[PDB]
Design a protein around this ligand. Structure first.
Ligand SMILES: *[C@@H]1O[C@H](CO)[C@@H](O)[C@H](O[C@@H]2O[C@H](CO)[C@@H](O[C@H]3O[C@H](CO[C@H]4O[C@H](CO[C@H]5O[C@H](CO)[C@@H](O)[C@H](O)[C@@H]5O)[C@@H](O)[C@H](O[C@@H]5O[C@H](CO)[C@@H](O)[C@H](O)[C@@H]5O)[C@@H]4O)[C@@H](O[C@@H]4O[C@H](CO)[C@@H](O)[C@H](O)[C@@H]4O)[C@H](O)[C@@H]3O)[C@H](O)[C@H]2NC(C)=O)[C@H]1NC(C)=O
Ligand SMILES: *[C@@H]1O[C@H](CO)[C@@H](O)[C@H](O)[C@H]1NC(C)=O
Ligand SMILES: *[C@@H]1O[C@H](CO)[C@@H](O)[C@H](O)[C@H]1NC(C)=O
Ligand SMILES: *[C@@H]1O[C@H](CO)[C@@H](O)[C@H](O)[C@H]1NC(C)=O
Ligand SMILES: *[C@@H]1O[C@H](CO)[C@@H](O)[C@H](O)[C@H]1NC(C)=O
Lengths: 537, 239, 267, 266
């Protein structure tokens, strides 16, 4: 009993250090206290450090003690220890890869309340991976996740993380000067750095205190965007900036008066929600109308929720779905969630499964677990290929399309040594196959290459021809019809015909400006063979 | 195994309870293939895992119905036949009579001519199968030639083949048109009239269902699952 | 020739060191050739191998037409090559047509014919000063003018058809230069015909000076008209004329000398 | 001289007509200057007038420094100017530093300095090739060399300061050209000192050839180092070098021949 009091104190000493310091050395000394509680069988410490051991993140990677600490977590009945043991049994990391066992662990992870076992089961029922493909099983599991994401981190949290593809970064590669430009007094540079500090992104960590000083510097300059952003910081509130409607609404009222679209949305929203002012339904709709007219993302979704719920305007679901479908193309999560809640319920639009689940999939793929794309990407750059594929194999399991290709790309180049050389080509074909059926083109060509060369399969020219054709008639990749021409001039998997080969060769010429050169040398070789046939005649 | 067991084998988690008997027909089950599982509410369950066989053809195929051409007789006699629209061309297959491919020539509201090109006029114990998108699928072939003559093939007539593939949600529509050789064609038709044939029907992998028996003392099915099934039946039927 | 051999073999081991570099990152046909034509260090070597296979080709095509240089054509060509290389790079970047495979090859093909047409002109001037002329040398001089005449008219008409097809572009400037070289071949053929006419006659040709003076007078007015219209067209164009400049002044200086010589002969 | 005066009068008349056209619809001096700066034909006329005035000033400076043309140095300077105008146009177009009047004057000054350096080298060679020499010509040559060296040093210092303060631009190429001109001026000063030492004695100097060979070898080494540095700067630069090209080969051919001659002499 005395160990339990010490272990809980040891966990809280590390948990306080973990939240307050973002340094890599400081985070790893936070996990030095969590690991001590793990040896004392502290429950909530075992969840945090076994995922750290498994993913090679904040601790040195070792699957064997990660798995051993998962089996201690399963007998207790943890929701997060049952889920990640399912991920091991699905990918065969230290175990013999039984999909029958991985479904049992996932189904008990989802009953336990986890939202990764709910995403994975919502993606397996949606794509028919290990189970029967089914709407209604994949809609119940993608809702409980999307209910959490939309309620918790809508804008109370918020995780706008870039989804960077390694194969695209190879084919075409993609802060101090910006900080120095803002140091010279530029209001636009300060607002750009302030947006990159209040929200974060592009490899820059969030800094609420630094964003407040940068926004106030541009606020004195009189920038319209900075004036609304300064009011928004005082409104929502934080540790650095206290929450107060009164000063925030007055500044937003001044911004909405002159020209601010961001100011117009906030001034209407403060009046609509009655944050420090009287509720004015007609004034809010009129103010947010110009916010929709100017093209504000947060204003278009704000007006639709007034008509979908019938607050101020008549319940015109045709007009309500007009705003939400407009805001969805701008990239707003609450537009995606509210659109999918209309399709699934059957109000406004007909009760459609399939449009709901692809809309519930995009709101689910922007949760708190999506930042592990960056941790998997940063571990790829730093030469940790064992810890960059594990964090990419979990997100590949969850249903991501970028992580079903980046995990397959790392396994394709034989870089990741956690899986054997004797298994890595079947494991890379598995995620090329999953990514190709999610509207990705390189994964459709690379599905053709694996059956062309026998990369993990028996060499099958007929199946390679199909995957090259499927990347031509739908996605129109220029390499997909150049490769289609080669199989027609050489007779691999199909009866040879030179006339079709030319057809499919010059199809690449009109489909991309990059194919003008390699079709020129290929048509000339085709012509020389044509010249060779007429000689022997 | 690599090619079939990659991810195509469906599993189902079922809860028959403490008083249950393992099935002796279909899939093979072993008493040593098992995992003990405990919920967060301290409800202990025993899940008996299945050995994946999913093999053979012992489905007792007994088909006393008519031939596959008998069902397509109503399709040909109806003469309500499908179209297909592409980038520039438009093939039109017509069931049992003719196959046509054309694009109507159009000037600035002036020209009314047509690129006229015929495709063909329709004047073994193993059913052939076609790899549709990498998955094997049976079909019924019918050949029709004597179309518009091929300029690039020694003035020989154009020959075509028509492929019927069962699809219960389709309405006799053209799936995809391709060429094997020049002036040699195949068209896959998704129609549900011949779905009644067991061999032509949509092949389904057998579900390797999992018995998660209740260890003595626990309820028949976990409590958080039971609350989950209740909400979904509530969310579904109003919707 | 051996010094050119060490230039060719060390170049072919640089082209094959950048192709075989690209068939290490992208192991197929299409992603290799696409990579080679996008990365500029890889595209630089292939341009080097193009010119190293052009000068070597030029050293071969200069052997069929002429047996060897006469120790003054090489000095004359190299002086004109410096002006031609400076002028060709001047008109390319000024026209804003970008460094493209279609633009670089077309421009360098003009200098391939311009140097071959300039070498025959020095041979044409040496033809009158050489009393010993064989049958084979006459046939080769006839052969070079026929290929120059056909290619000049073919490049003139195709560029003129491109003017009606698209409009004002860089092809009008290159077509105008080929038209100036078109009359250069005809003047060279006229001088070759005039010298061969004087070669057959075993007496001094009194009308040779009158025919030569009238030929340059015809060339001077044709060059002036082809340059004045080009300057007026480039005046009303998006960019300034710039480009040749000196070749028009060299033609005008030769035309002024030819005009003064005809006035002195007439008076 | 009559043709030059007639051309200058015609250029002045054209400039006056352009000025009248500018101050015929814009009464204010500021609006007239703005219209002149915003008009392509007025700018072209002003550039032509400036070029004519610069040619007249260069002719006056050449008449002040050199007594008369040598009938071959004039042709050499004409060929050098014909090459240099094309080289300057190619450098201006290739560098993509935008067409402005602030760099045309600097380019003209650099061309005039290069022509003056070539004329000074030709005058030194002619003085070495002539037995009759006057003290006035020597004093004028010394004054011209001192003025050219001072101007080259000032331009090199200004270009170095601009490169260190601003960054990478055409000022780096201007500084490299100024350094090449300074090296040429130092070599010409050494050659003039050797010629003055040799002309003071009424006998052939056997060590004059060895000293000239050593000076030529040092100048070739300095030119090779400068050319290698300029080529490395162009390779590290984003833009293509183009530019002179021919002067690098001439320096390399002279340095290789002099080293072979020195090895043959030794
Ligand atoms: C945008 O607009 C449309 C739709 O929005 C896009 O599809 C279009 O992309 C391309 O645009 C052009 C211009 O409209 C389309 O028309 C072109 O096709 C004309 C018709 O030719 C096609 O079909 C013939 C028929 O051949 C055999 O076909 C089968 C056997 O396979 C037999 O059943 C049949 O009986 C024939 O025997 C093809 O031969 C032809 O292919 C051509 O042949 C060469 C090899 O020699 C191939 O490499 C090329 O693919 C080539 O196109 C076409 O598939 C063609 O016009 C013909 O020739 C002359 C030139 O126009 C005409 O004067 C003749 O009257 C004759 O019609 C020519 O290709 C047209 O340009 C084109 O089909 C379309 N898509 C493609 C690439 O197929 C977009 N562009 C625009 C602005 O329209
Ligand atoms: C509980 O903690 C002890 C520490 O003494 C250690 O043996 C192990 O972590 C746990 N014991 C078990 C699981 O029997
Ligand atoms: C599962 O993998 C472990 C790894 O050591 C092995 O010991 C065990 O026999 C495997 N179980 C099988 C193959 O059924
Ligand atoms: C706005 O005022 C209301 C009471 O009028 C208060 O409950 C609310 O917390 C205020 N808003 C914020 C962000 O504090
Ligand atoms: C593993 O690789 C070996 C060769 O290294 C070969 O027997 C085969 O590819 C694989 N064998 C097994 C049993 O996995």
């Amino acid at each position: 009993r005395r160990q339990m009091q010490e272990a809980e104190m040891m966990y809280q000493t590390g948990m306080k250090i973990l939240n307050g310091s973002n340094k890599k050395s400081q985070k790893r000394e936070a996990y030095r206290y969590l690991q001590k509680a793990a040896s004392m069988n502290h429950t909530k410490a075992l969840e945090r450090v076994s995922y750290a051991l498994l993913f090679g993140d904040y601790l040195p990677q070792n699957i064997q003690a990660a798995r051993e600490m998962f089996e201690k977590l399963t007998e207790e009945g943890s929701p997060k220890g049952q889920t990640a043991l399912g991920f091991l049994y699905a990918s065969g990391l230290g175990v013999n890869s039984s999909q029958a066992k991985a479904l049992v662990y996932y189904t008990f992870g989802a009953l336990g309340g986890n939202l990764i076992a709910h995403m994975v089961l919502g993606y397996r029922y949606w794509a028919g991976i290990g189970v029967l493909q089914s709407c209604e099983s994949a809609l119940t599991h993608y809702r409980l996740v999307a209910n959490h994401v939309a309620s918790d981190i809508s804008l109370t949290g918020g995780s706008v993380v870039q989804r960077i593809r390694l194969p695209d970064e190879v084919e075409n590669p993609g802060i101090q000067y910006y900080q120095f430009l803002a140091e010279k007094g530029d209001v636009q540079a300060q607002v750009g750095l302030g947006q990159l500090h209040l929200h974060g992104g592009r490899g820059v960590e969030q800094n609420h205190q630094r964003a407040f000083d940068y926004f106030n510097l541009a606020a004195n300059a009189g920038n319209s965007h900075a004036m609304a952003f300064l009011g928004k910081m005082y409104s929502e509130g934080s540790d650095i900036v206290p929450q107060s409607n009164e000063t925030a609404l007055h500044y937003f009222k001044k911004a909405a008066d002159m020209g601010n679209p961001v100011g117009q949305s906030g001034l209407g929203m403060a009046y609509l929600y009655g944050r420090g002012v009287q509720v004015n339904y007609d004034l809010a709709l009129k103010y947010f109308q110009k916010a929709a007219e100017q093209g504000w993302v947060d204003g278009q979704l704000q007006l639709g929720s007034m008509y979908y719920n019938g607050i101020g305007v008549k319940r015109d679901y045709k007009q309500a779905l007009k705003y939400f479908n407009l805001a969805s193309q701008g990239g707003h999560i609450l537009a995606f969630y509210n659109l999918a809640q209309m399709h699934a319920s059957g109000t406004g639009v007909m009760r459609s499964c399939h449009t709901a689940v692809e809309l519930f999939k995009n709101v689910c793929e922007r949760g708190r677990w999506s930042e592990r794309l960056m941790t998997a990407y940063n571990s790829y750059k730093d030469g940790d290929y064992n810890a960059a594929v594990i964090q990419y194999l979990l997100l590949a399991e969850q249903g991501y399309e970028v992580a079903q290709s980046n995990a397959a790309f790392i396994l394709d180049q034989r870089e990741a040594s956690i899986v054997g050389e004797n298994e890595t080509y079947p494991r890379a074909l598995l995620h090329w196959n999953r990514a190709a059926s999610q509207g990705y083109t390189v994964a459709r060509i690379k599905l053709g290459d694996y059956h062309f060369y026998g990369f993990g399969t028996d060499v099958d020219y007929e199946t390679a021809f199909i995957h090259y054709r499927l990347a031509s008639e739908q996605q129109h990749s220029a390499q997909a019809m150049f490769n289609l021409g080669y199989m027609h001039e050489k007779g691999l998997g199909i009866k040879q015909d030179i006339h079709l080969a030319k057809r499919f060769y010059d199809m690449a010429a009109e489909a991309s400006p990059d194919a003008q050169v390699p079709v020129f040398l290929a048509l000339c070789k085709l012509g020389v063979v044509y010249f060779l046939q007429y000689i022997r005649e | 195994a690599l090619p079939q067991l990659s991810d195509d084998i469906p599993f189902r988690v079922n809860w028959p309870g403490t008083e249950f008997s393992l099935p002796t027909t279909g899939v093979l089950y072993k008493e040593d293939n098992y995992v003990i599982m405990t919920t967060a509410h301290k409800e202990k369950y025993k899940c008996i895992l299945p050995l994946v066989t999913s093999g053979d053809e012992e489905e007792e195929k007994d088909y006393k119905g008519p031939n596959p051409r008998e069902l397509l007789e109503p399709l040909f006699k109806q003469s309500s036949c499908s179209y297909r629209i592409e980038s520039y061309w438009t093939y039109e297959v017509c069931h049992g009579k003719h196959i046509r491919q054309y694009h109507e020539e159009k000037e600035t509201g002036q020209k009314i001519n047509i690129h006229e090109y015929y495709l063909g006029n329709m004047l073994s114990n193993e059913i052939p199968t076609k790899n549709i998108e990498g998955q094997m699928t049976p079909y019924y072939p019918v050949g029709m030639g004597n179309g518009t003559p091929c300029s690039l093939k020694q003035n020989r007539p154009r020959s075509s083949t028509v492929m019927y593939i069962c699809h219960p949600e389709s309405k006799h529509e053209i799936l995809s048109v391709a060429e094997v050789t020049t002036c040699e064609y195949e068209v896959v038709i998704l129609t549900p009239l011949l779905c009644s044939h067991p061999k032509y029907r949509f092949r389904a992998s057998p579900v390797n269902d999992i018995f998660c028996q209740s260890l003595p003392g626990s309820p028949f099915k976990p409590l958080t699952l039971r609350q989950l099934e209740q909400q979904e039946e509530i969310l579904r039927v109003p919707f | 020739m051996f010094r050119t051999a060490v230039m060719m073999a060390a170049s072919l081991a640089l082209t094959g060191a950048v192709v075989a570099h690209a068939y290490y990152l992208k192991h197929q046909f299409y992603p290799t050739v696409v990579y080679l034509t996008k990365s500029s260090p890889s595209m630089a070597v292939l341009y080097i191998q193009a010119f190293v296979l052009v000068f070597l080709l030029g050293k071969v095509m200069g052997k069929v037409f002429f047996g060897q240089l006469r120790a003054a054509e090489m000095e004359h060509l190299l002086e004109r090559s410096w002006y031609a290389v400076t002028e060709t790079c001047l008109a390319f970047t000024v026209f804003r047509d970008d460094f493209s495979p279609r633009f670089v090859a077309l421009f360098t093909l003009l200098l391939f014919l311009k140097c071959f047409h300039w070498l025959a002109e020095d041979r044409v001037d040496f033809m009158e000063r050489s009393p010993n002329i064989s049958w084979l040398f006459h046939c080769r001089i006839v052969s070079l003018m026929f290929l120059l005449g056909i290619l000049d008219f073919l490049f003139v008409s195709h560029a003129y058809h491109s003017i009606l097809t698209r409009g004002a572009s860089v092809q009008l400037v290159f077509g105008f230069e080929y038209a100036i070289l078109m009359t250069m071949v005809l003047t060279i053929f006229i001088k070759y015909v005039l010298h061969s006419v004087d070669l057959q006659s075993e007496n001094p040709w009194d009308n040779k000076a009158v025919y030569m003076l009238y030929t340059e007078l015809f060339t001077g007015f044709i060059k002036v008209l082809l340059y004045m219209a080009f300057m007026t067209i480039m005046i009303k164009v998006h960019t300034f004329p710039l480009f040749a400049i000196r070749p028009m002044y060299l033609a005008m200086r030769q035309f002024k000398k030819a005009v003064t010589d005809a006035i002195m002969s007439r008076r």
